[PDB]
Amino acid sequence: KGPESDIVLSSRIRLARNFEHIRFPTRYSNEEASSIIQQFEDQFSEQEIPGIGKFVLIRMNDAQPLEKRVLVEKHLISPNLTESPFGGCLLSENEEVSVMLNEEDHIRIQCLFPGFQLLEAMKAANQVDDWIEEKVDYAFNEQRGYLTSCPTNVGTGLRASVMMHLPALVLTRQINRIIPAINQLGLVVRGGNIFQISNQITLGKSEQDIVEDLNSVAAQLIEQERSAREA
Amino acid sequence: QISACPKCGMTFQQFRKIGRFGCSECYKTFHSNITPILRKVHSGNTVHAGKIPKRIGGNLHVRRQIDMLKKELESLIHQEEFENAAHVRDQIRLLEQSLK
Numbered sequence: 001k002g003p004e005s006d007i008v009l010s011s012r013i014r015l016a017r018n019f020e021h022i023r024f025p026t027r028y029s030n031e032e033a034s035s036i037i038q039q040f041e042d043q044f045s046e047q048e049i050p051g052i053g054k055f056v057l058i059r060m061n062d063a064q065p066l067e068k069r070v071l072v073e074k075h076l077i078s079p080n081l082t083e084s085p086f087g088g089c090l091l092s093e094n095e096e097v098s099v100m101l102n103e104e105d106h107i108r109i110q111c112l113f114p115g116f117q118l119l120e121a122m123k124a125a126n127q128v129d130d131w132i133e134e135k136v137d138y139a140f141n142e143q144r145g146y147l148t149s150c151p152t153n154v155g156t157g158l159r160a161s162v163m164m165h166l167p168a169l170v171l172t173r174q175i176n177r178i179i180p181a182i183n184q185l186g187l188v189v190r191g192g193n194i195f196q197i198s199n200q201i202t203l204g205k206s207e208q209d210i211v212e213d214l215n216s217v218a219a220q221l222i223e224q225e226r227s228a229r230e231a
Numbered sequence: 232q233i234s235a236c237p238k239c240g241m242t243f244q245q246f247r248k249i250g251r252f253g254c255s256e257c258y259k260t261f262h263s264n265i266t267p268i269l270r271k272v273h274s275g276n277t278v279h280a281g282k283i284p285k286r287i288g289g290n291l292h293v294r295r296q297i298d299m300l301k302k303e304l305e306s307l308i309h310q311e312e313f314e315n316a317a318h319v320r321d322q323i324r325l326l327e328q329s330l331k
C-alpha cells in the first residue's frame with residue numbers, strides 16, 4: 001500500500017520531547033517516570049484526535065512478553081523499552097501513529113506511513129505534537145529549541161526517515177556513487193537491497209526544510225530506480 | 232566557571248563521560264560549553280531555526296516584551312525621563328500579572 005509501494009517501503013517521522021519541569025530519563029526518579037505515564041493514561045489514553053483516530057495506552061508493565069515482541073517488530077517501541085518498568089506506548093487504532101514514553105526522552109512521537117508520504121506524516125506528527133503540547137509543558141528554549149537527552153537530537157528534535165527498496169540501483173553499480181552523494185547532501189544512509197535515508201542534523205534548519213530536502217532526494221532516487229528497472 | 236546543575240545535579244565532567252543531559256537546566260548550566268558541541272554535530276549550526284510550541288510560545292513572547300521593556304526602563308533611568316520610567320515600571324507589572 002501507499003504511493004510508490006513498489007519502491008518506498010515506508011516514511012517515518014519522529015519527534016523527541018521532554019517535560020520541562022521533570023528530570024530527563026537520565027536522572028529522573030521512578031515516581032517521576034510513573035507520573036508521566038499516568039498523566040498520559042489520564043489525559044490521552046481514551047481520546048480521539050479527529051482524522052488520526054483513537055489512541056489507547058499500552059503500559060509495558062501490563063504487557064505480555066510476546067505482545068512486546070509484536071510491538072518491537074511493528075516498530076512501535078524500541079527494545080530498551082521492553083524491560084523499562086514505566087515505559088509505555090500510546091498507540092492509534094490504525095497503529096500508524098504512536099507515542100513512545102520514558103525511553104531516551106520522555107516522549108517520542110512517531111508517524112509511520114506506508115508509501116512515500118513524508119509530508120502527510122509531518123502534518124500528522126505536528127498534530128500529535130500540538131495535541132500533547134496543549135496539556136504538557138514542553139522542555140523548550142527559544143534559542144536552542146526543543147531540549148532532548150542526546151545533543152544529536154536537540155533543536156527540531158525531528159528525525160525523518162525514508163525506507164527504499166532499490167534493487168536495480170544496486171545491480172547497475174550506481175549505488176556506489178550515490179551513498180557518497182547522499183552524505184555530502186546532509187543525509188545519512190544505512191542498510192540485501194534495502195536502504196534507509198534520514199536527516200543528519202536537527203539544529204539550524206526548519207522541520208519544513210528537513211522534510212523538504214529528504215523528500216527531494218528520495219524523489220530523485222525513486223525516478224532513478226524506476227529508470228533502471230525500465231532498462 | 233565549573234558548576235553543577237541545580238536540578239539534575241550533573242556536573243560538566245559527568246556530562247563528558249555520559250554524553251546525555253540531566254534535565255532542562257543542564258542546557259542552562261553548560262550553555263557556554265555546549266555551543267562548541269552543537270557547532271560540531273550540526274555542521275556549524277547552533278540556533279534553532281524551527282518551531283515554537285503553541286501554548287507556551289506566547290508566554291515566551293511576553294517574557295521577551297518584559298525584557299525589552301526592562302531595558303527601556305534602564306536607559307530612561309540613566310536618562311532622567313522619570314515620568315516615563317514610571318510608565319515602564321507599570322507596563323512590566325502588567326505583563327507579569329498576565330502570566331499569573
Ligand SMILES: [Zn+2]
Pocket residue numbers: 236238239253254255256257258259260
Ligand atoms: Zn539541567
